[PDB]
Assembly symmetry: C6
Homo-oligomer: 228 residues x 6
């Protein structure tokens, strides 16, 4: 991450972190990809950088391998077109005498550009999901002094950003809302957990139950418990 | 929210958040719309972005559907004018051969622009009110260590920004001032609630009652209660 | 408060807040008006914005009504001049065919400009004093953990900024120094209040009396009181 | 303090505050005057602003009255020169047909400029010392939780900035170090005050004596005192 | 670190600190070198600065000594080429009549530049590893009030940045996670240390064990211990 | 420190403070001098400012006196050269008809410039060491709530920046590490001081001994001591 300054830093910094804490195929990352891909039209060079600067080394290597395969697919299609489309593998990858540096890739037509975009995004989706890298839905833990309402919001935020199906997302938040809570709050949730009535939102009850923990009142109570 | 940088970010970021926490038809959002609509005269492209970047996906879809309908209405009127006004649906939506990109929409006359503004603002108002999305008047809760006066001010601020009729606004603040207070303060308000005499402002009394909570004095008292 | 950016923001933001917390005719606001009016010479358009962006809706409406009246007065005078002065109502309000947009108002002579300034400032002073809007001299309250010396300074600051006659200002600060203090400090002031000897400044004694509240010493004392 | 922006703000803001908290003739203010006067050569207009923007209304009026007198003195000298020096009162004050606006004053010769500088600085020194305005050497007080070493440093800083003769400065710091200390520290200094042996610096001993106040150790002690 | 401003500061500041806290051959430093070397193509002058500004005096001297040796090696190779390559020692070091200042070094060909890069990076790797300078994997210690989860993350971060072989890295983190913990947490880890079952991650258990330390609950417990 | 803005501020601000807290001949100041002198080549005017803006009034006066003497020395040498070197005292000091303002000094040759640099740096070193001005190695004291590890690091930092011979530096840090510690930590070090075994670093042991002070554990202990 050196070289003084590139034509764009923030977005690349953000995505790099995003991938590390949410995963290459996460809703969060997929959203940014969608955003940036449809907006800042990219050339094969750009994609080379965008992935290189945001995916972990091994993840990049899978991306690029898949990329190449995707290109090959489209080249078959382009030769099979009637009329044929004059776009070779070299143009789609940004590899060769005619499509090397930015100056040549800058002259790509929208047909080629689009086709590259499609390919890459497919390739991206083909990146193997991390089963171990900061699966943030279970790394977020309540800090010793953090208000439960902040915790939960944080948790949910992460869940929105990592878990794709809302149904599952909901379950996970509920489970983690208990499991990763600090002792101070688990003791409030434990007698509630599993007894929450239908209709009422679970994490909603959980906030209520913990309402007050961390304040003066709570401390006083615990001081009573220390003496008694 | 990628693509490095647009010609304007802050306002769009603000409104996006605003809609999420106060709602599309809220006084807050409606105020900003009014401000920006009458000021930074907009073209159909702009409106497409302004809504797309601030409304939730489903909300956008309702906006645009309504938008189109609104256009149709005005087109009927324009054809029914004497003399006829040369403004077709294509010009009002920014869809077609003559009114596609910004460069063509930039040449719209003030008659067309205005008409678009009117339409959109009507369309905006036709967006279905969220009955669930962060109804912030009941999401704001007093933090464990927050002074009651800050809480209330916050509450009121939100109420000004979400509840349109002052009469109702007042009631809601009063109710929420008790309900969402932390335990430390509810215990001070509970013996007061419902016994507040006419004339005297309710939340004014509530502040008085809680004056002192959170300081050293309060803690000392509670330490007495811990021992005793 | 949208439209991306105007040729000037901070001053207008400041004044808007100022009016809300101190009042249209307050020493604070009157000072800024004086400053800006004599300095950044203004055209009727500017005044239209300056008031529109800083006065509350109802307050603006009173301003402008009065503005017009003021203009009428000066127009009578201008016609009664010997030689007559060629300045009509249209020029003073910025309303009409010859004095509409900024481009025409930019060509106003200093005689007209001045006359507008005089009018507006008079008009401003004719805005009805709020008897309810954040009368900050009685909204400032001591926070639960705030040192009394900071409180007092704050109070005085506000008093300088809202109360015009120093004599009264002094009384009000003294009264509010007690009344809006937190319980921790009222208990120190109560036995002093009303018994302060002549000559010695009242709030000076009040600081002395409360010197120490909020520190470790104070807490220790109160812990004694909790146990005993 | 409005008018959007002048060609220079920071310095003027600083000096205004400086005068309010240290006084027009204070070492601090006199230092900045010396600095800026010898450096950024000024014209009578500038001086008019520099004083107007930094001295309190009444103080300004005394400045300018004295200014004028000073000019008169130099005009006598200039007429009495051999050869006579062509510098009239109008040139030194920046008042008149030939020396009005900046454009004319910009053409002043260094002889005139200097002479103005000399005059003003003398005039400045003739401003009556405030016997009441924030005599900061006795307004600085130790906060309830402030470390004593910090307090002292602050005190000294102020003393350097307000008291001119070091001999007196030293005495005042020593006296105020005790007098304005918080109760927690006075109790440590009181048994030392007045018994400090010669040679050893007084405030040095005072720091030693209070070393430790405000930490956990100190609190524990005081908790013992609460119970006992 | 004076001279007002160079054409680039941040990176050089970062690396200087990096070398001091992680070491010249650390994964962290080696990563930045790789990044910057392959990206911002450098001339011998640049390398002279890059090392001079980031390596400790003695470390620089070893670098440069090795640098020269490396050059000599390549010069042998260049003379042994068929055809011979016209690159002398003077060109590779940036020393001499033809390759002195930046203006002459700017004209180096990519063959020479590359060759310099290779040399330097080899030379860099030949810098003797510090066995004493801030071996940060054992300087990071848990602060008295720091949550254990933050500590550990910090520790790991440092380990990633200083220890090259992951296998060893893991061991070191585990050992230091106990050893450099504060007393509050060691008492929680001590009964666990060495009894952690296979499969379960060690520092994962360690976090669990310490979950809760530093909160109100923990303090209450300890207050019980104080009394009892 | 007025005059709005010079061509360079930061460095001069830094050095001024540096001299005040570490001393004119300190390693810290000497390092910056070396840096800036060899880098931003200076003219006699610059040196006049650099010293004037960083040395205390009396210190400046000694500098300049010595400066002049140094010049005289070099002038003797220049006249004694074979061939003679055309550099008079006027050129080296920046005093006279031919070498007055920056415009003339800008035309100095590198021979003259260098010679000035040498002179000044020698002159600088001839500035009398302060035996009283903030000898920061004995002004830094541990704050009431500061972790011992931060203290120590701070101390060492200062020692690196003020004490030149490492041998002595080490002793001083060790002594001050005890002496300027707060009571909370002295009580931990006192039983260790002087009994530290050879080989093991002294301040290393001192950190260990104090590890834990300031946390919850420590407070609990002290609460026991309060009751008992």
């Amino acid at each position: 991450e050196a070289r003084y300054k590139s034509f764009s830093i923030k977005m690349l910094k953000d995505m790099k972190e995003g991938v590390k804490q949410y995963g290459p195929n996460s809703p969060y990352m997929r959203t940014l990809l969608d955003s940036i891909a449809h907006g800042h039209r990219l050339i094969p060079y750009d994609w080379e950088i965008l992935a290189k600067s945001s995916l972990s080394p091994s993840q990049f290597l899978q991306f690029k391998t898949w990329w190449i395969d995707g290109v090959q697919e489209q080249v078959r299609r382009n030769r099979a077109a009637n009329p044929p489309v004059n776009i070779d593998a070299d143009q789609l990858l940004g590899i060769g005498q005619n499509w090397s540096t930015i100056s040549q890739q800058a002259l790509m037509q929208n047909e080629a550009i689009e086709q590259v975009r499609a390919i890459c995004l497919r390739a991206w989706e083909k990146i193997q999901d991390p089963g171990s890298t900061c699966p943030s839905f279970n790394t977020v833990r309540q800090g010793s002094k953090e208000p439960y309402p902040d915790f939960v919001a944080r948790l949910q935020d992460v869940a929105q950003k990592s878990i794709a199906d809302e149904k599952a997302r909901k379950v996970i938040v509920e489970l983690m809302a208990y499991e990763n809570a600090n002792p101070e709050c688990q003791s409030a949730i434990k007698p509630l957990k599993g007894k929450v009535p239908a209709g009422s939102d679970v994490i909603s009850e959980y906030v209520k139950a913990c309402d007050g923990i961390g304040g003066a009142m709570h401390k006083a109570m615990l001081m009573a418990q220390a003496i008694t």
